[PDB]
Design a protein around this ligand. Structure first.
Ligand SMILES: [Zn+2]
Lengths: 218, 58, 103, 142, 159
RNA sequence: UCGAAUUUGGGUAUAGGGGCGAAAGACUAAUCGAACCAUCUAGUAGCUGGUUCCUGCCGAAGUUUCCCUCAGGAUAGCAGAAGCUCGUAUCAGUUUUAUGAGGUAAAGCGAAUGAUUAGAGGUUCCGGGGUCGAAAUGACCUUGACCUAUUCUCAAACUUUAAAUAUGUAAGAAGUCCUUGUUACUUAAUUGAACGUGGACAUUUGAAUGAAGAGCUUUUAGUGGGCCAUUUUUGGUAAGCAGAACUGGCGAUGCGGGAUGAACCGAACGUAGAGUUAAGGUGCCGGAAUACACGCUCAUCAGACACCACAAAAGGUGUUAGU
RNA sequence: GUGAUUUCUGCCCAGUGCUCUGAAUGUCAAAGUGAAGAAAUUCAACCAAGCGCGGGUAAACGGCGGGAGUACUC
RNA sequence: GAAGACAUUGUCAGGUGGGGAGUUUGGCUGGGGCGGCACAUCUGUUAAACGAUAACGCAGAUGUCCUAAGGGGGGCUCAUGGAGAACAGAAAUCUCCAGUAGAACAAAAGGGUAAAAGCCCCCUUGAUUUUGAUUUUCAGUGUGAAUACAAACCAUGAAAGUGUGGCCUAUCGAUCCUUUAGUCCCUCGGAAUUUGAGGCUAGAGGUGCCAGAAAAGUUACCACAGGGAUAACUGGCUUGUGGCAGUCAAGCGUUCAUAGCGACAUUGCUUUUUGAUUCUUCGAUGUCGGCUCUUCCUAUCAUACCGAAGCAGAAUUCGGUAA
RNA sequence: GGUUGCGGCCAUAUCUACCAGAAAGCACCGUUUCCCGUCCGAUCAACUGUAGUUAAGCUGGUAAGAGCCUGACCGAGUAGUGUAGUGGGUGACCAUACGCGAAACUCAGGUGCUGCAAUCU
RNA sequence: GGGCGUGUGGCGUAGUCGAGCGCGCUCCCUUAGCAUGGGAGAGGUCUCCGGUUCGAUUCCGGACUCGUCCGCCA
RNA sequence: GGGCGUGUGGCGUAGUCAGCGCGCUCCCUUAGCAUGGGAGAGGUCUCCGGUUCGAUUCCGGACUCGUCCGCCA
């Protein structure tokens, strides 16, 4: 009962989010976005691999769900359920419309054609760009060959072209590997639930000393 | 039998055929819309000025 | 709406030329006289054969009328008219609105 | 104004209409196409509020019908004498102009006033004629 | 149906601005306009009386009438294939003097000063403005400025 | 069907909104849901068709507003004709300089509004579930809220910020400066406002470029179905679909090229001669190198040129070059 | 109007018509009557039939329902 | 003989009167009809940062309400949160603190507003008179709405000032006719007085199809002028839907992803389905089905030769060259 | 230079937490007969400048302070965009040519200036 | 043709992941009639078969299946 | 298909930004002719959000029935 994704592949319309002018959309099919060992610390998983688009198109929420399930299932079967952290870095906010025509014989007796042809919501999609990350996984250096294969299996569920790039960053942060290493040898990083908070030279010295004590322990 | 609703095609060409002449400006523009208390005094001021110039160059 | 029965307003009655006290009423049209020229012409045109000779209006659309206040100066008896906006309910009896009291 | 126009399709059930210069209340509405090409015609069956007679009609749907202003007002009885009720308004105004009802409503109201209940009377105004339709009893404020 | 009211499509045009709402400062009331002054029109949304229409926002005109709290301004409006003359009564919160006119008057007085001082010698005053001429010959030296060779950089991911 | 509610001759009666009808709107002289003839009558038609010699010059519109207006008119616009007042300017689909105005593209969300993923630390006179508890505004875990510092992703009807392109004004003589006349306006007041008298400043007189004359008036035709292309863009799965914005076109237009074609590329046209080219081409059709140079490809459906006359995901120790 | 014979033609007069020798001021023309006026005229009373009120009429036009319980019943 | 000043007849007046006559029975519109109002308007957006800008585009709204919810002045600060106080608790009243508006301002939405434009109190009628000018829509017509003045007369405050309805953007109506107010002015044409009538200036009674006819159907008995500007065939563009084919592989298959299948996803093809559109045809291209007859396509049911199997034989299934 | 009265621009001026303030001026402060206003002389009104106090207001300083302001060749000539091609690509879209040119980020600095009149060790 | 729902004892019919009632009738007792009542009875492969579960109407898949709904042309 | 209306105790319906009646169950009362009265038990107002001082009342979404249409080809 669902149209093929080629009818909604391209970004032909303006963004159409769920708002107080829509008020009746179907809920998204993808619901879980972070999975694997999502409660892991930052220095547990140094390596990060990205599935990144090469197209300017719309990805369906159904396709996002299918790719998430495929990559998660493959990596938990080959490497264990808590050896990786996968994060879906796109969210379906664009709403797809359909002008539903009757498929009955002699429909033109009651069709009215293209008059008042404004559509009804039937699906949700995420609008991506050139070089935008869809999937991001962080793991140890011993799981590179299985997370590349997991992303390669997940790439079949997506239209268009995607690339698998091994990032130069440490995990889900934005510093490089030696930059993060020379930062964490000092005490100016401090862990959070999954992420890490950093020290800055601004701010009040009392707060900067109750937090982050080992760097000032010089 | 629907038809074309509205367009602005060819309109700037039609205007710029013999078009976009600026209005002619003049010395001594019109005093309509100017404040009547100003004009009522301005009449007497010009009348006195004309009488003084006539008496000077009589 | 509500309008008070009296009003101090301008009177151009050639002796006042100022704000005097005025008693207000509502304007009533008064009966259409016979021997008005249009009525005589209409009766002459409607006599004989030919049926109805003038249009009769049917497609009524308004539900209200504009109210007209008849002001009457208490000194020199001169009268003025002024119209208001359209209102479904109108009254001249002054029952003033009061604020901090119950429903 | 006393009365205001409306469209036949704009009319619906339990609404007031003017039929043959009578205030009437609709009980039935039915629309049937005149011809396959043509517009539907509205058949209206209504009951006069004052007299209870049944008056019907058939007009074009686009035609405009006259509609009265009906006001229902709430009063307390003071006396029933000579077939004329005497009523008492909020803020203490009193009217005696209402004639007493002549049917089983009037009989029940007469017996209720004879045996001494405090009676709440609903009287309706439409197109310059006045009547009483129903009575209740005040459950509180005895 | 369609809607073309007097203040249609004027949402961001007649918003005030960020963090300068409230009452207007007294310089706009202390400024003095004379007949023949050239003024810019920018409406103030805080003042609802004497407002200009949305067409005249950002338009520049000439004062022709001065009244108690307002100013009469003349604008030229393109209607069809010609310009028409439009007279507007605007309160003084919606106008300010055009700075280009006072810049030109400063050029006039400095230009007359130059002509007056150089008339005592006759030194070919050359009072017209000239645009940006092509830059002439020069000698650039390498003393402490030996050239540094640059090359295109190879490609990287940078994510 | 054939002895009768039979068939039929002649005479006679009924005449056109009338007749007659065992009823079909049947018949009433090949004419009937109102006969025929003549006149009114050359009835009216916003609708279809046609509209008669040559050459020269200029040359459109399918757009604004109103209309029982939507196949039509009026009105403005576009066009022609007649000119008139002057003689290089009170010009300009252009740039520069100076100065305004704007809320789109972009960006932002550890900034307001709204949406939204994940943990962390706290708050229980201040939650809910279990377990331990006599019970407890009891305890221990868990889960929900709220707060605090973070984190992932977004907005036609969100925004602090904010372009590019378009867009207003000014670049003087109708200007600037000095002095002092008028007034019933205005000021405490010759204070100011406006218009003035007299005097000074001229060809670099106030940026560039170009001007093909500049300005003004009257009158009237046709038109008021448009369509296509690039870019922006709306509805739609889409359409040689429907609807907008700026420009250029076709209509109204031939010529060279795209084999062919209204719109594409090039270029717009008096009659000829010579030369050079545009776009496109140079094996032969076919005018012009089976030129030169470096590589790649062998297809048991090769490929061969924009608009344009289609092909995708996924693969291949085919072959080549790379990381 | 229905359409030989045979056998039957149930219920409904609220609506729309049709029909009364009923009862009688509600609607209520012209003429006529009264008042006011200087008159044109204005205002009232009175006011025929028909409407309106009250009956009849379906071999007149026509019409012939629901919800529960247990064919039945409410 | 009967009847008799009653019938009859004549003229007026009321009723009845499809028996008959005349006429009417909107427009837009992805054909028309039904539906809706995109028909007079308003807010935000589409709208592409001046202005303008379409669709039966999106989200909504209007035919009202108000003697205060208008005008002037004075005092005060709101939503919310925290901490307290008998009954009194989630919500009654009182007190303090924080509080850029997160409240309120009649209504739809968007702007604007903090010693206020909000809440409370005091006084009032400027929601008044006289005609001009200007802005929006625009033909620079009307109507509606609005802006700034002039000449009066007022309100309020100590005053500067403010006020010509509602904080701003919507909230509404020609000619003819009737009626009211003013001037108590002009005319009734042989001359006067008084009624009556007609004029001048300003309002009201209303046309919502909102620049403004007085208006029910049917036609299968039908007619005329036209239209491919416009529907019902084929053909053409598109392929949602229909049909057919792939890729990936969580699983089914005792065990085993792929012998045979194959979820969640995703890429295509076809024009033997039905839609969408309106390009051609309305001075006509013979619109069901069957019978008859020829040829073509392959996405192969059988026959020929083969490959694979969860092929022992028999039977079967999957696939290839093949029309 | 401090302070007061009236201001202009309206955070470099605001906010949070501390510290300091000679002189003068502001301020808190004392009182209810009179004018006046309140449930309440708390606000407002009036009287005294006397009985007192810098505790607060106010001013200034401090803070790897929050905010705000300025600058950068910091990001970045990046994103976006005007013009051009019989450029690439099935397409989606993307390079190049002639031009214009952001925002976030990062870093550095700053934290009221000033007009008129009066008055002050 | 397709879609969708459905299924309990001999019959009917109620069901939380923990097969009950009524009826036919099995028996016994009962009663002046115009005859009944009472007390104990049997009976399911929860349509069927797998997986799940801790065991399954109860959870899930397949098949059966009865009922529904929608479908051609001129 | 679409449009319009509908949904409230056992039952039936209304309405202001849960009500009665009729049923009931209890109790009292009454030569009655007749009974009558007083109390109870009964409703997520179809549902879910928002709006509002407050929602049956206002609104969005959803579900449930009942109707009326789907023509000329
Ligand atoms: Zn007077």
């Amino acid at each position: 009962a669902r149209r093929p994704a080629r009818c909604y592949r391209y970004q032909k319309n303006k963004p159409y989010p769920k708002s107080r002018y829509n008020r009746a959309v179907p809920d998204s099919k993808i619901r879980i976005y972070d999975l694997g060992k999502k409660k892991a610390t930052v220095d547990e998983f140094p390596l990060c691999v990205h599935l990144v688009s090469n197209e300017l198109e719309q990805l369906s929420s159904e396709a996002l769900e299918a790719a998430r399930i495929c990559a998660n299932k493959y990596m938990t079967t080959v490497s264990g359920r808590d050896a990786f952290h996968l994060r879906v870095r796109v969210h379906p906010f664009h709403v797809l419309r359909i002008n539903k025509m009757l498929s009955c014989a002699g429909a033109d007796r009651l069709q009215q054609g293209m008059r008042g042809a404004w559509g009804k919501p039937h699906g949700l999609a995420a609008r991506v760009d050139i070089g935008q990350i869809i999937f991001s996984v962080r793991t140890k250096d011993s799981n590179k060959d299985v997370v590349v294969e997991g992303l390669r299996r997940a790439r079949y569920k997506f239209p268009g072209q995607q690339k698998i790039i091994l990032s130069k960053k440490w995990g889900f942060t934005n510093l490089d590997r030696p930059e993060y290493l020379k930062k964490r040898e000092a005490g100016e990083v401090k862990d959070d639930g999954a992420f890490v908070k950093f020290l800055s030279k601004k701010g009040s010295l009392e707060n900067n000393i109750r937090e982050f004590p080992e760097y000032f322990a010089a | 039998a629907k038809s074309k609703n509205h367009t602005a095609h060819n309109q700037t060409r039609k205007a710029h055929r013999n078009g976009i002449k600026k209005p002619k400006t003049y010395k001594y523009p019109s005093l309509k819309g100017v404040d009547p208390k100003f004009r009522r005094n301005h009449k007497h001021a010009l009348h006195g000025t004309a009488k003084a110039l006539a008496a000077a160059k009589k | 709406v509500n309008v008070p029965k009296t009003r101090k307003t301008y009177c151009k009655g050639k002796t006042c030329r100022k704000h005097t006290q005025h008693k207000v009423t509502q304007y009533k049209a008064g009966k259409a006289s016979l021997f008005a020229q249009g009525k005589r012409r209409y009766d002459r045109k409607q006599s004989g054969f030919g049926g109805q000779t003038k249009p009769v209006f049917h497609k009524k659309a308004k539900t209200t009328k504009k109210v007209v206040l008849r002001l009457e100066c208490v000194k020199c008896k001169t009268r003025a008219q002024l119209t208001l906006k359209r209102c479904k309910h109108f009254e001249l009896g002054g029952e003033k609105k009061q604020k901090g009291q119950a429903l | 104004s006393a009365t205001y126009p409306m469209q036949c399709s704009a009319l619906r059930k339990n609404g007031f209409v003017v039929i043959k210069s009578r205030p009437c209340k609709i009980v039935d509405m039915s629309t049937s196409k005149t011809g396959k090409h043509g517009h539907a015609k509205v058949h209206l069956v209504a009951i006069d509020i004052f007299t209870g007679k049944k008056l019907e009609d058939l007009s074009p749907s686009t035609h405009n019908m006259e509609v009265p202003v009906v006001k229902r007002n709430e009063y307390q009885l003071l006396d029933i004498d000579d077939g004329f009720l005497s009523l008492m308004n909020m803020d203490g105004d009193t009217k005696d102009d209402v004639k007493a009802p002549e049917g089983e409503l009037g009989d029940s109201l007469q017996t209720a006033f004879d045996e001494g209940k405090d009676l709440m009377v609903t009287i309706i105004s439409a197109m310059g004629e006045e009547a009483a339709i129903s009575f209740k009893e005040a459950a509180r404020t005895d | 149906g369609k809607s073309h009211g007097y203040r249609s499509r004027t949402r961001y045009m007649f918003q005030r601005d960020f963090r300068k709402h409230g009452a207007v400062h007294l310089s706009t009331y202390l400024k003095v306009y004379k007949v023949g002054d050239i003024v810019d029109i920018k409406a103030n949304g805080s003042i609802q009386k004497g407002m200009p229409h949305k067409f005249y926002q950002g338009k520049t005109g000439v004062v022709y009438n001065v009244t108690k709290s307002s100013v009469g301004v003349i604008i030229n409006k393109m209607v069809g294939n010609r310009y028409l003359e439009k007279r507007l009564n605007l309160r003084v919160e919606h106008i300010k003097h055009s700075k280009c006119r006072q810049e030109f008057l400063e050029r006039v007085k400095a230009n007359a000063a130059k002509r007056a001082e150089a008339k005592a010698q006759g030194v070919a005053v050359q009072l017209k403005r000239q645009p940006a001429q092509p830059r002439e010959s020069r000698i650039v030296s390498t003393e402490g400025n030996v050239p540094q060779t640059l090359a295109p950089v190879p490609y990287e991911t940078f994510i």
